[PDB]
Amino acid sequence: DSKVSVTGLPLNKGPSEKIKRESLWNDLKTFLTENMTEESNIRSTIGWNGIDFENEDFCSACNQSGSFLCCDTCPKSFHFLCLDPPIDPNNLPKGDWHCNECKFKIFINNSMATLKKIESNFIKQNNNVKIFAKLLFNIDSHNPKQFQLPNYIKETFPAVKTGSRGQYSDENDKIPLTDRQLFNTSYGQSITKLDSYNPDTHIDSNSGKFLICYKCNQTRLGSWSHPENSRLIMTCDYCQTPWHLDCVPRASFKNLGSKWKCPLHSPTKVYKKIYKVWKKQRLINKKNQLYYEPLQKIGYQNNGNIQIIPKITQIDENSIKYDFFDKIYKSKMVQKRKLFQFQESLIDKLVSN
Amino acid sequence: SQDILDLDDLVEKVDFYLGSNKELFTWFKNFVGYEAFGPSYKRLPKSDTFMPCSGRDDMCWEVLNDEWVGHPVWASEDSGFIAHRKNQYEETLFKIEEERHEYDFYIESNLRTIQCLETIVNKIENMTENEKANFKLPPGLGHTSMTIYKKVIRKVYDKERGFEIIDALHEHPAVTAPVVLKRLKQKDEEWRRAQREWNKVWRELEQKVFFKSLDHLGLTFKQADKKLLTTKQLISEISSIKVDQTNKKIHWLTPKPKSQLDFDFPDKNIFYDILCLADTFITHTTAYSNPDKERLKDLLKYFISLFFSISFEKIEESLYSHKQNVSMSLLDILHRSRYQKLKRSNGNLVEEANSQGIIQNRSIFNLFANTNIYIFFRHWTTIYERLLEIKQMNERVTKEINTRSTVTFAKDLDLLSSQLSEMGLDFVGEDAYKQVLRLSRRLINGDLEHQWFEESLRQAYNNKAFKLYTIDKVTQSLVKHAHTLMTDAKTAEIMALFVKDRNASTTSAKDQIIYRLQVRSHMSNTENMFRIEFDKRTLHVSIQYIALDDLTLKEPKADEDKWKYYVTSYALPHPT
Amino acid sequence: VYEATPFDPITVKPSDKRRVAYFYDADVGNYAYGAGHPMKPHRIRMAHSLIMNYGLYKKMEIYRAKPATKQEMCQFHTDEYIDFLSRVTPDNLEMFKRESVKFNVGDDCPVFDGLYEYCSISGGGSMEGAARLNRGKCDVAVNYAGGLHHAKKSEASGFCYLNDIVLGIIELLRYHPRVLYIDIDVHHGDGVEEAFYTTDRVMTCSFHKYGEFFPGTGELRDIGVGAGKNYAVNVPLRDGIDDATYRSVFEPVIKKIMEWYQPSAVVLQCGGDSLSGDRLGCFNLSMEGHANCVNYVKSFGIPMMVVGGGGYTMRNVARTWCFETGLLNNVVLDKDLPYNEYYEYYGPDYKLSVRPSNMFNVNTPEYLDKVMTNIFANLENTKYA
Amino acid sequence: XXKXX
Amino acid sequence: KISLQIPIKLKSVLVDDWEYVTKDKKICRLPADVTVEMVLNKYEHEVSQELESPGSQSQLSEYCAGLKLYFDKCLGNMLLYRLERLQYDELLKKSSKDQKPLVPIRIYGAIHLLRLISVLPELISSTTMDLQSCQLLIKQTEDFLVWLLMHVDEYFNDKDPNRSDDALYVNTSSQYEGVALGM
Ligand SMILES: [K+]
Ligand SMILES: [K+]
Ligand SMILES: [Zn+2]
Ligand SMILES: [Zn+2]
Ligand SMILES: [Zn+2]
Ligand SMILES: [Zn+2]
Ligand SMILES: [Zn+2]
Known part of the structure; x- marks a missing residue:
């Protein structure tokens, strides 16, 4: 029938000479079945019956890709939910669809003396809220948008960056993998999962010595006449402390989603379970982060938002020492006197009998 | 301290800081007085869990879960799912299996509908013209499926005409069933003939790459073995073991760990095997002149006869029994003038510390070496361990290969590839180890290709014997290092000192210190040093990396031995 | 508490003679997902041929379960999703562009032909298989067309459109108090774990590969919520695991589960993409290191239900399934294949064995120590059945 | 992402 | 150009909300427990007793009425992220079904009022107002912002939808995310 299939040629055709050259060197018992299968309908539920321009390739509102309803007058295109009001993709009114801006233009007949007229009349009518008059008149000339924070708000926090499609990123995003486009190409079986080669993953890149795991205090480099003794060292993304995969019970190398964080950072969110929430702020840089050094040391509380020196409270190791010891001592003695009073009350209640 | 963290959370966090210290962590435990908990699921509000779900009875609401939800797009953090490599x-x-499956799918569907049309035709002809004029088929043709015959007839009959022909078949099959059956018949035979003509080529292509597809460590070995068998790696390994020993014995409670490397040589014929391989390479190669060749041969011979204390007569009898079937001391060669002339002729403290502890009938010998001798010895141990691996697989693999149950039903139909056999590379009931050694000798001689050596070593054993693909380069490097051990002057002097000491029958700590000072006299003050210790009673070897301030013997356990050794070292004016 | 072990051969138990029932519908093999997708219902046909040429039909009963109805499918899934599945076709797909994005049935899982019928065959086989286990009237129930453990309640994922393991377990729960579900695929059985995540009547236990691997669920710390806490066991492993390591991990966990949970029925999903030389899997099991799990689960002697699963190379899956069924019938089959219709797929040796690679194994003993210690610490709290 | 096709 | 000063606590509230509706895939719980009408009515009823002169009261009432009208007219047009337009469509549907028009001030909470406030300077600078009127609007908005900062602990709690209940945010299913974003 002459149409090529997966094999390269028509189905009613043997192999070509090129394939057979570069690919060469130079009664049964399931006849049965329609005799042994007998249907099963033993189940419990058997009772159940059962200007010739073209529009843009992106949404004018969210600036992303998809299936667009387009406008004929102007090259704008919108998603269906990205309109005002959103349109049902099935029940689409055919006829001439225009956007808000072109509809405003055709309504005013592209005459702005009439814009003067209607806006003056509008501001005369909306006498109750005269401050919001002109504002309330401009909203009707704009095609819809989506919300994006003003840039004077995003730039108060410097660890915050707008992602690709206007998404949130906060320094815990590892990065997209650029030479992992180079990874689809790769070096042959020299994988990005870090297998089969760990002689130079146990060696400090810059200094030259070995990376020693924090928990076991060894760099088990193994010996590559016996590769079953290596132990897959990995370093934290924040403090660069090295850990074995068998010590932090992880079984993976974090490569794509976020940065891996050592067990040696305190929290960033608590859930006290008593339940209450954070004791950790955001990093308000721009050199508006003001510090305070309290004049009293052994009682100041102020937050879980301290900074340790040799609003952010500046505190030193001595005050932390004293506060820890004080808290545990007084909690100790208070719980002991509570048990004392309970047990003595118990004895006078029991001898009362 | 500010009542934000719970007590057990604090203790679990401090466990990640002082976990490996038992004293401190127990003191902390004793002094301090000691919801979605899974990362993968989210709880939806009880306003999204209201869908009809008709067939659910009262138990299916009690048992099934409708609130907690996971999905592989936010468990991947919106960017993930790496895949395996698949060489x-x-x-x-x-691709061969895809073509096979395509052909089988089409053929089998065509026949599944051909049988149904066959039975409906043989039932439809048995009528009189009345019923034939009134006959019609229900949707499904009396079978259990409704879409198979539709798919087949549309694929065969130009889908538009396929639709009109199928609804005509549904309307009056008395006239259209025969022609559809004929077309299905002819296209069946056509596809089947093409399928067998394609089955020949698929078998030979798959016969070449099946075994090559199954070794993920042998396709990357010849390039990972010249990068990882260098000097820097072989020294980094022992350095890392050393720093691990020290860094972890800082933990005082653990017993002291001794020297860095330990090797054992249970088989004594692999030495003659390696000697035969090296001799073949020397006799073939053109890099050295004939003097250099015989000097290298004798150097290797007497070095292995000296270090491992194997008698020269046993060596000669071993190579006798070897090569008849194929149908002075080392210092004489160290200062090569000797060998050329040869083959041309053809108070109270120190004293009583010295008095008790004399080792007579010495069995533990020491060799203080620089990097040259260490690297030579390590190449030797590498070849030994590889040959020993295959010699230990030998008996099971030969018992397996001699009993291969080849089915003659696949013998006659050309279904088995004899291309490895007609050239004599299949391991027939000969020995496996001897056949491997003979093949490697032919490869070193340059009379056997690399591809066929690797294919033999795949098929015969498994993809388990891949470490022999570089058996010629390791011998190249071995002979090169054995030449280095006699070109240099410093290493020549070191090996001469080793000969003089090994030939000596009795020693003491004083003589060991004198010998260490003697060998360090030749090499610089920045050189590394190794102690290679041979224990003869069990044929064991231990390699110790010497930090310049090392105790040149292994650490004792008693005050007596330790302190008397260093106070008898106090006798010599060398620094402490 | 892990300890290394060797791998001794498989020897059947002469006492445990079970009346096995086998479900096969001769139509399932003719529905193909697409040109080049790695899912073939042809691998279920191949297997059957082997099973019939070894003479295993004289040993068990062969049935053909009547296929599920749209209202026995909706015992788990929703009416809108089942209606979409029943209505959609490759030609009218352009008319369903809003439900192709809601229900995820466009491209990873495509619309190909007779999709509703493949799902009906799978579900009917498994519900019927489980229904014959309750009526007292089998001991093992084999059904290889099932095992679509990825489908969610109102979404398809992972080439799976209908979750029939859940329908089978619901049919089992009508007579058995506690049910155990073991999953030895290379992936995570996320649909079966989600459907029974807050219940203490089904205990799911899955051994999978965890990393940046599909579907990315199933960490060691997913143990359930609500009344079904500690009744979900996830064993994550690394690449290249072998027969002896998998055995030393599999047998203690399952023995502990059976000792503390004490299930009344088992459901073992024996999908074979955890074999060596697969297109998507990364493990290094052989045929016998894959059938040892089935033999061990059969050891305990309670009503069992074996279903199929993944498997992307057709010959490996066919041979492993034939061997597993053979040892379920208390015979170890010959290693020389008989002449069957698909004889030429099994080159070049033409034997019943699947060979492992020399791939490097990265599952160290200390990692498995930690994992098994955590798992046993959790399981300590499910004792009083 | 997903499983292949 | 116009400039408005927002307390940094409300800026962090807005950044948190931007983090939730974006890569956390959460929406708001509607109808809110405290809507825009309730916040503005409480504010006006609490401040109208503060200063005596009638002009302050007239200005306050006019500002609150205009803010109500403007939020009503602006919410669907410009104040919604892309994930939250399916919610808007479903509310619009279930409103048109009951023959009742949607009135957004009685449904949406204070975070959307905060969005409107934050975006106000650009909308002001895009019109042709006076300068006196722009600075009057900015003064009124800054006074409202300090009043709201005094009550921030009452409208903007953190409660983990995944943990107990009744937080100001809710999780979305994969069907909602499939039809909303990737459609
Ligand atoms: K699994
Ligand atoms: K469960
Ligand atoms: Zn859009
Ligand atoms: Zn327009
Ligand atoms: Zn470690
Ligand atoms: Zn860290
Ligand atoms: Zn799978």
């Missing part, structure tokens, strides 16, 4: 020959196999 090239696996891809070649995948």
Whole structure:
């Protein structure tokens, strides 16, 4: 029938000479079945019956890709939910669809003396809220948008960056993998999962010595006449402390989603379970982060938002020492006197009998 | 301290800081007085869990879960799912299986509908013209499926005409069933003939790449073995073991760990095997002149006869029994003038510390070496361990290969590839180890290709014997290092000191210190040093990396031995 | 508490003679997902041929379960999703562009032909298989067309459109108090774990590969919520695991589960993409290291239900399934294949064995120590059945 | 992402 | 150009909300427990007793009425992220079904009022107002912002939808995310 299939040629055709050259060197018992299968309908539920321009390739509102309803007058295109009001993709009114801006233009007949007229009349009518008059008149000339924070708000926090499609990123995003486009190409079986080669993953890149795991205090480099003794060292993304995969019970190398964080950072969110929430702020840089050094040391509380020196409270190791010891001592003695009073009350209640 | 963290959370966090210290962590435990908990699921509000779900009875609401939800787009953090590598020959196999499956799918569907049309035709002809004029088929043709015959007839009959022909079949099959049956018949036979003509080529291509697809460590070995068998790696290994020993014995409670490397040589014929390989390479190669060749041969011979204390007569009898079937001291060669003339002729403290502890009938010998001798010895141990691996697989693999149950039903139909056999590379009931050694000798001689050596070593054993693909380069490097051990002057002097000491029958700590000072006299003050210790009673070897301030013997356990050794070292004016 | 072990051969138990029932519908093999997708219902046909040429039909009963109805499918899934599945076709697909994005049935899982019928065959086989286990009237129930453990309640994922393991377990729960579900695929059985995540009547236990691997669920710390806490066991492993390591991990966990949970029925999903030389899997099991799990689960002697699963190379899956069924019938089959219709797929040796690679194994003993210690610490709290 | 096709 | 000063606590509230509706895939719980009408009515009823002169009261009432009208007219047009337009469509549907028009001030909470406030300077600078009127609007908005900062602990709690209940945010299913974003 002459149409090529997966094999390269028509189905009613043997192999070509090129394939057979570069690919060469130079009664049964399931006849049965329609005799042994007998249907099963033993189940419990058997009772159940059962200007010739073209529009843009992106949404004018969210600036992303998809299936667009387009406008004929102007090259704008919108998603269906990205309109005002959103349109049902099935029940689409055919006829001439225009956007808000072109509809405003055709309504005013592209005459702005009439814009003067209607806006003056509008501001005369909306006498109750005269401050919001002109504002309330401009909203009707704009095609819809989506919300994006003003840039004077995003730039108060410097660890915050707008992602690709206007998404949130906060320094815990590892990065997209650029030479992992180079990874689809790769070096042959020299994988990005870090297998089969760990002689130079146990060696400090810059200094030259070995990376020693924090928990076991060894760099088990193994010996590559016996590769079953290596132990897959990995370093934290924040403090660069090295850990074995068998010590932090992880079984993976974090490569794509976020940065891996050592067990040696305190929290960033608590859930006290008593339940209450954070004791950790955001990093308000721009050199508006003001510090305070309290004049009293052994009682100041102020937050879980301290900074340790040799609003952010500046505190030193001595005050932390004293506060820890004080808290545990007084909690100790208070719980002991509570048990004392309970047990003595118990004895006078029991001898009362 | 500010009542934000719970007590057990604090203790669990401090466990990640002082966990490996038992004293401090127990003191902390004793002094301090000691919801979605899974990362993968989210709780939806009880306003999204209201869908009809008709067939659910009262138990299906009690048992099934409708609130907690996971999905592989936010468990991947919106960017993830790496995939396995699947080397090239696996891809070649995948495409062959795809073509096979395509042909089988089409053929089998065509026949599944051909049998149904056959039975409806043989039932439809048995009528009189009345019923034939009134006959019609229900949707499904009396079978259990409704879409098979539709798919087949549309694929065969130009889908537009396929639709009109199928609804005509549904309307009056008395006239259209025969022609559809005929077309199905002829296209069946056509596809089947093409399928067998394609089955020949698929078998030979798959016969070449099946075994090559199954070794993920042998396709990358010749390039990972010249990068990882250098000097820097072999020294980094022992350095890392050393720093591990020290860094972890800082933990005082653990017993002291001794020297860095330990090797054992249970078989004594692999030495003659390696000697035969090295001799073959020397006799073939053109890099050295004939003097250099015989000097290298004798150097290797007497070095292995000296270090491991194997008698020269046993060596000669071993190579006798070897080569008849194929149908002075080392210092004489160290200062090569000797060998050329040869083959041309053809108070109270120190004293009583010295008095008790004399080792007579010495069995533990020491060799203080620089990097040259260490690297030579390490190449030797590498070849030994590889040959020993295959010699230990030998008996099971030969018992397996001699009893291969080849089915003659696949013998006659050309279904088995004899291309490895007609050239004599299949391991017939000969020995496996001897055949491997003979093949490697032919490869070193340059009379056997690399591809066929590797294919033999795949098929015969498994993809388990891949470490022999570089058996010629390791011998190249071995002979090169054995030449280095006699070109240099410093290493020549070191090996001469080793000969003089090994030939000596009795020693003491004083003589060991004198010998260490003697050998360090030749090499610089920045050189590394190794102690290679041979224990003869069990044929064991231990390698110790010497930090310049090392105790040149192994650490004792008693005050007596330790302190008397260093106070008898106090006798010599060398620094402490 | 892990300890290394060797791998001794498989020897059947002469006492445990079970009346096995086998479900096969001769139509399932003719529905193909697409040109080049790695899912073939042809691998279920191949297997059957082997099973019939070894003479295993004289040993068990062969049935053909009547296929599920749209209202026995909706015992788990929703009416809108089942209606979409029943209505959609490759030609009218352009008319369903809003439900192709809601229900995820466009491209990873495509619309190909007779999709509703493949799902009906799978579900009917498994519900019927489980229903014959309750009526007292089998001991093992084999059904290889099932095992679509990825489908969610109102979404398809992972080439799976209908979750029939859940329908089978619901049919089992009508007579058995506690049910155990073991999953030895290379992936995570996320649909079966989600459907029974807050219940203490089904205990799911899955051994999978965890990393940046599909579907990315199933960490060691997913143990359930609500009344079904500690009744979900996830064993994550690394690449290249072998027969002896998998055995030393599999047998203690399952023995502990059976000792503390004490299930009344088992459901073992024996999908074979955890074999060596697969297109998507990364493990290094052989045929016998894959059938040892089935033999061990059969050891305990309670009503069992074996279903199929993944498997992307057709010959490996066919041979492993034939061997597993053979040892379920208390025979170890010959290693020389008989002449069957698909004889030429099994080159070049033409034997019943699947070979492992020399791939490097990265599952160290200390990692498995930690994992098994955590798992046993959790399981300590499910004792009083 | 997903499983292949 | 116009400039408005927002307390940094409300800026962090807005950044948190931007983090939730974006890569956390959460929406708001509607109808809110405290809507825009309730916040503005409480504010006006609490401040109208503060200063005596009638002009302050007239200005306050006019500002609150205009803010109500403007939020009503602006919410669907410009104040919604892309994930939250399916919610808007479903509310619009279930409103048109009951023959009742949607009135957004009685449904949406204070975070959307905060969005409107933050975006106000650009909308002001895009019109042709006076300068006196722009600075009057900015003064009124800054006074409202300090009043709201005094009550921030009452409208903007953190409660983990995944943990107990009744937080100001809710999780979305994969069907909602499939039809909303990737459609
Ligand atoms: K699994
Ligand atoms: K469960
Ligand atoms: Zn859009
Ligand atoms: Zn327009
Ligand atoms: Zn470690
Ligand atoms: Zn860290
Ligand atoms: Zn799978």
